[PDB]
């Protein structure tokens, strides 16, 4: 009789503390190095792959982002790393990062029209255009919000209270126009000293325009600073203003509230089906570990920044 | 560590495709490789359970969500990107060291299993079977295929083969 | 800071006027120094502007061998208008433009203006 | 070049009542910075020019707050609320945008 | 002779890396997985209970929380997870979370009347009440601050400057009232525009109310937003106001500064003593690890979020 | 790992409760279970040092100080919600792995203490002690109670009573 | 013939899990517990040390911090734990901590004169001194910013602009003077109602002063809240103010953008050279782990809090 | 663990600087302590790769960048202080446990090298060399120096020196 061990004519290698390359028999790899290299669906839901746009270019509807005027159910949102169509009119948005954070837990919006254009008797809605936001070459402005300028040589106070009769949380967007000098407040509006009072059960704002000179961004100097709120069921949002009001015309209703992410990648849209998405390429595998990228949405392997992570489930 | 992989055994023989561990005999009634399923199965189930354990621990690790910060929160972003980098360096370390140590254990536990089969065959056959250096044995008595099947089964009886001569 | 224009008072057409302006009570540095003409009843005309280091700027509308001159040691800047042809009769003014047109784009205007001077070219 | 035009030429104004002087020209009179470049110069009879309102609508040192200005682009407006008999002069308006600085025709103010 | 090992009749089982549910011999369990289920004292110090009361209901004296009118030395503050009586008048105390942070190191408060009732002449003390806060069915506001309404159809300028001659730090609480409209602003206060200015050695604030149309919380349409400061020895707080002033009446002098946590637990208080305390119970053992809850205050086992830790000390 | 459990030692004894590691003899002058208390005390001191080391490295373990954040600071909350859990998950894994490795090592440690005891008796006794593979040395030489007691004491030396007959 | 091993004349000891204080043969100690106790250069670059000075004292150049008028290239900034000459006039530089973050990646400044003292024709640049910021026993003020008092009893709107034609980023510093009362305003600034409006491509700011009664810090009841920005190439900063303006005089062009730190150490500067610097002292060793301190600029060993780490590379 | 240090070797010598595993031989030619550079070279290379793994898998630790926070940011200052102290305590525990586990593994690995050298010299001379307990052997055949060099080299032929008694 004799005793001994198997050999399997194999070249695969494993790592140990006391030696680096050891020839191994029946080693099981746990690291998924490969990927298909394109973005596609999660469990049949087409993702919201907005191209050359951003979250602020989508929620405030950019004239250069027209493809997403009615968005179906999505599993995640993809924005390119350095998008060009975003805040075409120079501006900012307060709690924009928090808005992305709360959008990372939303899987579906129902775009509702909370405020119509017929609810502006004494204010212009068609002259609110800009040359820094082109639409087929012509000047245009964001669809969702209307930059109300004066009508008939004056700006009557805008006392509008909207009651949330729906059974879902409403994401409501507006803004304020920090103009570049007082002559544009004389021309765009009538009152020099203007305010925007926003009242909610859990929000108080008393925005005032900063009327001083600024440099040129995108060919213009005025800055529209945008703001948002989330309105509960049977809660009422109250807008009072006498100038600089970027009034809402569309709002978003949160129907599905689950798991998503604001992914940053520029990879084109491909046609496949999978359970996990990673920004440089979708992983379709069941290995315990992946090196592809830290941020992964779905049932995915855990990220480990390593190479050659292989356990020796066999001898030698 | 245990010293049967390139220890007692110079090299494992090729052509014994039944698990990892096995015997070899040059008896008259055939001279072919086989395998000790009971011990190999114990080692296999142990490795399977080991792998299940490793995947089990990896659940509920740090899932790095994407938190963005503006220009005036660089302190907060340098906190957050360093928390994520630190947790990644920890979990990468707890991957790499874990499978480094576990490979060093598994390539020594399989060495332990080979030495366990070797010294278990030596527990039996105390005087009848001379112990050759290269992990082998030669019996004083002519020991047929039935006794080799018995020491595969572990039901050997030394008082039957009291034929040292 | 005050500016004092010292002038010839008359010049025949062939020669070049010699109209100086001296900074008294202040410094010449870091301010544009510009000449502004006033013909009788024809408004105000900007002749030129000299930054202390250099970068003389003339008036394209009329070219009359203009040589705006500057000297820091004496705290003085000077005007010469050769090829005069009796159209330059003016109650000339030297003025201290308080502006920088380089990386600093501050403009505060011609705060200080000289008492004046008169020249009737014949 | 840039040629300006006074829209009023002479303003007989009762003291204690605001006036209105305006001038404009071809370009937009706004430098790269964006601070409208205009000045208004009094040039009282016998005296010399004084800055008054500068850089469009901002007041010089020493000049009392009765003077004010407004406007951007082509259109402009000087306004002297509660005018007084000290405020006589011509109010030349100078375009300071480009190199060949030019002046207006002047508004000689007569006390009513 | 024969070398062997002992085998008991025990049933304890440990789960190794390779084979799970290994039976052992006289092994030691390092996991407690038990608790009193009640709140006990820590080293004889009776904690602060706050039954249906919060920090904002305690520091600012909620008329519902009149059971804690004189608080002895406490070891830890027990809030409930959803308190029902906190900020009975709607509003938000600024840096309430950071005040809870500082309140996690303060193990004792001794109230003092820094501002007595005679301090305010020409104003109306303790006759400005809101039905949002009930006491016996008659309306009554907080009892650690005074909401000064216009006494005699006017409002003289509040100018008070408390020099801290005490050798300890004083927590001083005030606030600003946000009236619902200008009519209520004129009815409650003679001055429409209010400029509540607070000066310290290391702090300055100017507060202007946000008078706006708002919804109803607790049957009220104004928002009293409160503020706080911690004064230093020989440091003078300075208050200046001409309306909308929730003036301080009581300040909580900091005597002891140690270790405390806001448990935010709704379990019933028990009459018992222990060395360590948990939100859902009390640990009364010296185990290395406890699975009961993350938050603990004392010499306690570390949290391990696992159900079975046993360090085998036997052969089997 | 060496082969105490299911190896040469088939199983454990229930009568003997004093001393983890023990000896049984069938000598004429009494038959009983005894304990080799030197190696057992070494094992108990090793296990006590193991437990003391585990609770000495775990004294600096991170604790969750409860921080509350308002509705408009969710990112910070989701950072602390991923930090207080995150370290906890790390510490959970560290606490799990420590009780998944040392326990195996402790079994191997007890296994080593059996085999280190076993072959110690083999090396001390050497030729005069035969080795039945169940783990029983049927001595060639008659041994009285005192010699067995010196084998427990470790002072038994082969030059004494060298009869191999 | 024999099988065995050796020992040596060694007293060094290691620890294991199962046994502590175990002798070893030719072991390697990986923990460096020795430091020179002095501050030296990092790769031949002399660091910027601050003796009783701060970043707010250096960037806004304190008259008592005049050792750093012309600073050469450094590699890390050393500050003392409590520097006395730090905002000698009271106040607080806004985003001081973010500015100290942005000075953790800068190795060299070029202090350039973007706004000379001759570029204030209508304001007083000589009398802007104070007794709270002394110099040689005389009143003085910071040397990198001008406190603009009115000139000829008049303070016009400033409307100064600076276009960054340099190809590097510029760090521009200014501030607002929060006075105590309206009488101090009218004494210093002719206009009562004052503002500062800062405009550029990204940063928008309006600063109304908070005139309030305050206690005494450093001898005067006044505050100067300072602010900063980074101006990009081909970007113009626009300051506009008719009062309370602490205008810039010098800017700090960023010519070497690398890696640095702020140490907060009171160690006297030694004269040697090494690669790794710690706040307590210096390390000149290639050991894997240092217990000296957490913060270590440069390529250094890894911090482990333990006091004895000897990897046993020896038999026993 | 394997039981050679204070096991079947009574103690280390004090005459062999060259090497870590040595052979003490009493021969007619003379006596000297061999260095046995084969096992010592493989063990030193294993220890060198161990130290290389320690310094390579701890290459990317938590770089504790000092960040500052003012008053009224004590929530985030506690977040940073507890984050840096937690990463420091995790990495301290990781380094402490790693040097403790590697000290145990290196002491047991040196013990395994002693026991595998003992087993390698036991496989050769399998019957001619009586195995004394205190890590020694007595050759039945008269062995000169060159057979000691052949044993220490690893090439020994049992068909040479085949006599028993
Ligand atoms: C092993 O692989 C080699 C590769 O050259 C081949 O020649 C040989 O036949 C293989 N042996 C077996 C048993 O597969
Ligand atoms: C191990 O193999 C890799 C290639 O797989 C090679 O780059 C490396 O140098 C090898 N290391 C050693 C120590 O032989
Ligand atoms: C909104 O509508 C509901 C349902 O009619 C009503 O109870 C509630 O008072 C309304 N809210 C406001 C703020 O008027
Ligand atoms: C992708 O995953 C599906 C199951 O989700 C599987 O059937 C398919 O084979 C995978 N595709 C590839 C190319 O591996
Ligand atoms: C274990 O159980 C048996 C009966 O099965 C009994 O004889 C013995 O005393 C028990 N021993 C212990 C230690 O409980
Ligand atoms: C281990 O024992 C527990 C408790 O009896 C049981 O619930 C679990 O299923 C067992 N698992 C295995 C794998 O034996
Ligand atoms: C904790 O245990 C000790 C000892 O058993 C006991 O005296 C004490 O009362 C217990 N404390 C509790 C239940 O609070
Ligand atoms: C070690 O030290 C002892 C005295 O403690 C001495 O006798 C011995 O020679 C030393 N060993 C050497 C030099 O190898
Ligand atoms: C170990 O040695 C150190 C050497 O300083 C000594 O302080 C200590 O008491 C010894 N024993 C233990 C258990 O640490
Ligand atoms: C407060 O009182 C102290 C003690 O009398 C005194 O020194 C100080 O000047 C007073 N004022 C302030 C503002 O501290
Ligand atoms: C600054 O100067 C450059 C070069 O002349 C010019 O292109 C730019 O428009 C100016 N202003 C700004 C705000 O960049
Ligand atoms: C620091 O160590 C290096 C490397 O050994 C050496 O060259 C240098 O002289 C040392 N410097 C000092 C100041 O000791």
PDB file of C-alpha atoms and ligand atoms in Angstrom, chain E residues 163-165 234-236 238, chain G residues 214-216, ligand 10:
ATOM      1  CA  UNK E 163     -22.874  90.124  33.511  1.00  0.00           C
ATOM      2  CA  UNK E 164     -22.021  86.558  34.545  1.00  0.00           C
ATOM      3  CA  UNK E 165     -20.606  87.120  38.020  1.00  0.00           C
ATOM      4  CA  UNK E 234     -16.936  87.133  33.847  1.00  0.00           C
ATOM      5  CA  UNK E 235     -18.582  87.238  30.403  1.00  0.00           C
ATOM      6  CA  UNK E 236     -21.614  89.430  29.763  1.00  0.00           C
ATOM      7  CA  UNK E 238     -26.142  91.352  25.915  1.00  0.00           C
TER       8      UNK E 238
ATOM      9  CA  UNK G 214     -20.900  93.230  22.714  1.00  0.00           C
ATOM     10  CA  UNK G 215     -18.496  92.476  25.552  1.00  0.00           C
ATOM     11  CA  UNK G 216     -14.754  93.281  25.545  1.00  0.00           C
TER      12      UNK G 216
HETATM   13  C1  LIG I  10     -18.541  92.247  34.378  1.00  0.00           C
HETATM   14  O1  LIG I  10     -18.168  92.159  35.733  1.00  0.00           O
HETATM   15  C2  LIG I  10     -16.785  91.993  35.967  1.00  0.00           C
HETATM   16  C3  LIG I  10     -16.579  91.729  37.442  1.00  0.00           C
HETATM   17  O2  LIG I  10     -16.890  92.885  38.183  1.00  0.00           O
HETATM   18  C4  LIG I  10     -16.028  93.219  35.450  1.00  0.00           C
HETATM   19  O3  LIG I  10     -14.632  93.047  35.537  1.00  0.00           O
HETATM   20  C5  LIG I  10     -16.361  93.446  33.981  1.00  0.00           C
HETATM   21  O4  LIG I  10     -15.822  94.648  33.496  1.00  0.00           O
HETATM   22  C6  LIG I  10     -17.872  93.477  33.750  1.00  0.00           C
HETATM   23  N1  LIG I  10     -18.195  93.621  32.353  1.00  0.00           N
HETATM   24  C7  LIG I  10     -17.901  92.725  31.390  1.00  0.00           C
HETATM   25  C8  LIG I  10     -18.335  93.099  29.993  1.00  0.00           C
HETATM   26  O5  LIG I  10     -17.327  91.669  31.608  1.00  0.00           O
END
